[PDB]
Amino acid sequence: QYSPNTQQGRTSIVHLFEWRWVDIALECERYLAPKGFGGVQVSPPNENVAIYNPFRPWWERYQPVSYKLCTRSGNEDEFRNMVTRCNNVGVRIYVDAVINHMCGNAVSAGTSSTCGSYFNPGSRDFPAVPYSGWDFNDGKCKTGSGDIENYNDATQVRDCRLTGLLDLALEKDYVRSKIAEYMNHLIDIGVAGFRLDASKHMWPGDIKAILDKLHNLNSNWFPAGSKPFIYQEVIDLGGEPIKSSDYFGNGRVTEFKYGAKLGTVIRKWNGEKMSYLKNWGEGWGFVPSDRALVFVDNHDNQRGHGAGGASILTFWDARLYKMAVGFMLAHPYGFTRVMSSYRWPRQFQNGNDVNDWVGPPNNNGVIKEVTINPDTTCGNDWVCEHRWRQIRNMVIFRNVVDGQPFTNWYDNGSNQVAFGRGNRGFIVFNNDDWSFSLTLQTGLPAGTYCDVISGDKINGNCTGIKIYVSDDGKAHFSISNSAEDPFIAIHAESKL
Ligand SMILES: *[C@@H]1[C@@H](O)[C@H](CO)[C@@H](O[C@H]2O[C@H](CO)[C@@H](O)[C@H](O)[C@H]2O)[C@H](O)[C@H]1O
Ligand SMILES: [Ca+2]
Ligand SMILES: [Cl-]
Numbered sequence: 001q002y003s004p005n006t007q008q009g010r011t012s013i014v015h016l017f018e019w020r021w022v023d024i025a026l027e028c029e030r031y032l033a034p035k036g037f038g039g040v041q042v043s044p045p046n047e048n049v050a051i052y053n054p055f056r057p058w059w060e061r062y063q064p065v066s067y068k069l070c071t072r073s074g075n076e077d078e079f080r081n082m083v084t085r086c087n088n089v090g091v092r093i094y095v096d097a098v099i100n101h102m103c104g105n106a107v108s109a110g111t112s113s114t115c116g117s118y119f120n121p122g123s124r125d126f127p128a129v130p131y132s133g134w135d136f137n138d139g140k141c142k143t144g145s146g147d148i149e150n151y152n153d154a155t156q157v158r159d160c161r162l163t164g165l166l167d168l169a170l171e172k173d174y175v176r177s178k179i180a181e182y183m184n185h186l187i188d189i190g191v192a193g194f195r196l197d198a199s200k201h202m203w204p205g206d207i208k209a210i211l212d213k214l215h216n217l218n219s220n221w222f223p224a225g226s227k228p229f230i231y232q233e234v235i236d237l238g239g240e241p242i243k244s245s246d247y248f249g250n251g252r253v254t255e256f257k258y259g260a261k262l263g264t265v266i267r268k269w270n271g272e273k274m275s276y277l278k279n280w281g282e283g284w285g286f287v288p289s290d291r292a293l294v295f296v297d298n299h300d301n302q303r304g305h306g307a308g309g310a311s312i313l314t315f316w317d318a319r320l321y322k323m324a325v326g327f328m329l330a331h332p333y334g335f336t337r338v339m340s341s342y343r344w345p346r347q348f349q350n351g352n353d354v355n356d357w358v359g360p361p362n363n364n365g366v367i368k369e370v371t372i373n374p375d376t377t378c379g380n381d382w383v384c385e386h387r388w389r390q391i392r393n394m395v396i397f398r399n400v401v402d403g404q405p406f407t408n409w410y411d412n413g414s415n416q417v418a419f420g421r422g423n424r425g426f427i428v429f430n431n432d433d434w435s436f437s438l439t440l441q442t443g444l445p446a447g448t449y450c451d452v453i454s455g456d457k458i459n460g461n462c463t464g465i466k467i468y469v470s471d472d473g474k475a476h477f478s479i480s481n482s483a484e485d486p487f488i489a490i491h492a493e494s495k496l
Contacts, residue, residue, distance in 0.1 A: 001211065001230035001251035002290060004335055005192040005222060006038030007090045011398045012329070012336045014386045015041040017299045018058060018360035019340075021074035021082040023370040024093075028086035030372075035392055036399050039092030041195060041337065045069050045079055046182065047115040047128070049103045056365045057357040058299070062197065063103035063165065066128035067182035070115035072360075072367050083190040087221045092192035094229065099179045099210070100198035101165035102126055102136075105146075121166060135175050137167040148201075154241045158203050170206035180213035183228075187215045192222070193229025199253070200234045200242055207232070207250045231293040231335075235307045238285065248291050255292040255334060256307060257285060259324075262296060263311030266324050266431060268415070274431050275411035281333040294334030296324045302341060303356040315341055315383045322390040323429060323487050326453070329394035330419070330427040330489065332406050336398060338391060341383040390485055393452035400491045401425040408443045412436075418477070420444070425491035430479040437478040442490075446471050449490035457494045 004013070014037055016024050024040055032040065044061045047068045051060040061071065069076040083093050102121070109120035117128035124133035141160035143149050148160045161167045169175050183194065199207065217226040230251025234244040237256060244253040261284060265272045281289060300306030302314040313321045329336055344358040361368040361381040371379035378384035385391055404422025411417040415431035420443040430436035446469050450457040455464020467490050469475040479486050 001193075001227050003227075004038060004092070004229045005217060005226055006092055009399050009402065010036055010038035010090070011402050012037060012338055012395050013039045013041055013092075013094060014338045014340050015299060016043075016340050018043050018061075018342060018367065019073065019370060019382075020367050021045075021078040025082040025085040027370070028082075028089050028091040031387065032086075032091045033089035036396050037091060037386070039094055039192060040086065041094045041096060043071070043073055044096045044098045044197075045071055045073065045186070046098065047071060047113055047117055049107055049119075050112045050114055051107075052112070054357050056359040056362065058359045059305070059357065060359070062098055063107065064098050064101070065103060065113040065119045066115065066117045066126065067178070067185070068115045068117065068128060069185075072114060072365075080189050087190050093190065094193045094195060094231075095183075095186050095191050096197060097183060097194040098197045099168070099182075100170070100201045101162060101167050102131065103166060104164045105161060105166050106164060124166065129178055131168070131175070131178070135169050135172065137161075137169050140169065141167065151240050151242075157242060158201055162198060162201050167201070170202055170210070176206070176210050176213065179210050183210070184213070184215050187228060188218055190218045190221060191228070192217060193231070196230060196232045196251070199232035199247060200236070200244075204246045204250060207247070211250055237307060244287055248287075252291050252293050252335065253287055254298075255286050255294050256301075258292070258294045258328075258334065259296045259298075259301070259313070260309050260311055262324050262327065263309070263313045266313060266320050266327075267311060268431070269311060274415040274417045274429060275413050277327070277417060278409050278411060280331060286333070289333045292334035293337060294328060295337040295339060296321065296328055297339050298337075299339070299341075302339065303344075303346075304353060305356065315339075315385050316346065319485065320431075321385075322388065322453075322485055323431065325385075325391050326394045326427065326487055326489065327429065329391075329398045330401075330421065330425065332404075332421070338386050338395065340386045343381045343383055389456065390453050393456065394489060396493070397425055397427075397452065397489055397491050400493050408441050410438075410440055421491075423492075425489065426475075427489040428477045428479065428487060430481060430483070430486040433481055435478070435480045436486075437476075439474050439476045441473050442469055442475050443473055444469050444475075444490070444492070445495075446473075448496045449475075450494040450496065451488045451490060452494050453485045453487055453489050457496065460496060462494075462496070 049063040236244040401421035408420035416436040418428040426442040450462030451465035
């Protein structure tokens with residue numbers, strides 16, 4: 001469950017948040033395959049509540065109605081078409097599995113659902129599964145409200161309703177079997193693994209019992225006996241009884257401390273600075289690297305949801321964001337996920353975004369196509385961070401340097417730092433309020449290298465900065481604090 005099952009030499013996944021299946025299929029073929037992306041995290045592919053007040057929020061997809069593969073992203077045929085086309089070009093699909101809960105207990109009964117299935121939250125009736133009152137934790141939860149009230153009580157966090165979401169009785173073999181039926185449908189279609197949503201709200205042993213029911217990956221594309229990649233969403237920022245290490249026997253875990261601390265460092269909050277990153281990894285209190293799924297931001301915390309955190313860097317902070325993503329993609333810790341977002345009309349009042357609910361770009365609720373502009377950016381209000389040169393080229397950097405050790409660290413005691421990945425790549429950052437001009441040991445063979453942040457290697461030439469490495473491995477770097485991107489990255493495949 002710990003291996004991503006990407007093709008050898010592909011080292012990241014991208015979250016194509018709220019994208020339609022047909023657009024992901026095309027993106028696999030036209031971009032993700034040629035640019036070396038390992039795979040795609042898709043939005044939940046199972047039927048959810050259609051919520052009209054407010055109008056079609058992104059978060060309606062975290063309120064299941066059934067396990068029919070029928071959503072605003074597309075139907076089952078479209079989902080299968082996407083998985084097949086992506087696998088055929090060597091780009092994997094990872095499903096966001098919403099298995100802790102069904103919808104909010106106060107949602108009105110009826111057919112306001114993405115496939116028109118009937119459901120009745122008040123009577124605990126989800127006949128398209130089917131689930132009934134016997135399948136929820138009403139009797140097991142001991143809180144006065146029936147909801148989670150106190151995160152210092154690890155039992156209620158698992159047995160009670162997360163903000164009123166009906167909480168499935170995951171101890172029951174029937175419920176475990178209906179979830180495994182859904183997940184095995186997806187595995188047999190060709191999915192390579194799963195994000196397990198709300199894993200903090202599930203007992204480790206119930207997750208294990210569900211995983212024990214899962215198939216190996218589809219043998220038309222994957223070697224015999226391949227286990228689905230599992231990454232469990234556990235928000236563990238250190239101050240609660242539940243520790244994400246309790247989940248290590250099941251799979252990897254999301255390391256939310258990663259982006260929280262990288263954001264505080266890059267924003268220079270509380271006296272933090274990039275020179276402190278020399279011992280980034282477990283030395284910062286993080287999970288073991290081989291159990292970490294890392295990211296700068298995710299779909300929740302880029303808009304203040306989940307545990308939020310004011311330090312989180314997002315595409316709205318483009319310059320610092322590219323730096324943070326670049327540091328993450330160069331550093332060997334963890335398995336990396338890149339975010340890919342849509343723009344919404346963010347509107348802060350008293351420090352909080354009142355439009356944080358707005359769903360994906362749409363016409364009368366129908367999600368808009370992803371359009372591709374001549375310059376390779378996206379239209380229709382899709383941000384497409386994964387197509388920004390500075391991010392795509394660092395996805396490639398990570399592939400090129402895969403397996404090489406962290407070495408040749410330099411810092412100025414403030415915010416000018418650099419490091420190498422064996423003899424295959426080198427990266428230099430200036431987050432101080434003055435210029436960084438210095439000759440550094442790069443660990444690389446002598447030659448001329450294109451900086452893949454300011455430009456590209458194209459037809460035996462560089463379109464941006466060129467770096468000249470001498471016989472001793474040293475090279476001069478110059479980065480103004482006013483540079484568009486105050487970091488430079490070079491690697492074996494950017495050498496002329
Ligand atoms: C995981 C999922 O467990 C979260 C809870 O459902 C989900 O949260 C979002 O959706 C819920 C339910 O619609 C909203 O109440 C929350 O405000 C919202 O953040 C996470 O997105 C998901 O990652
Ligand atoms: Ca639960
Ligand atoms: Cl996540």
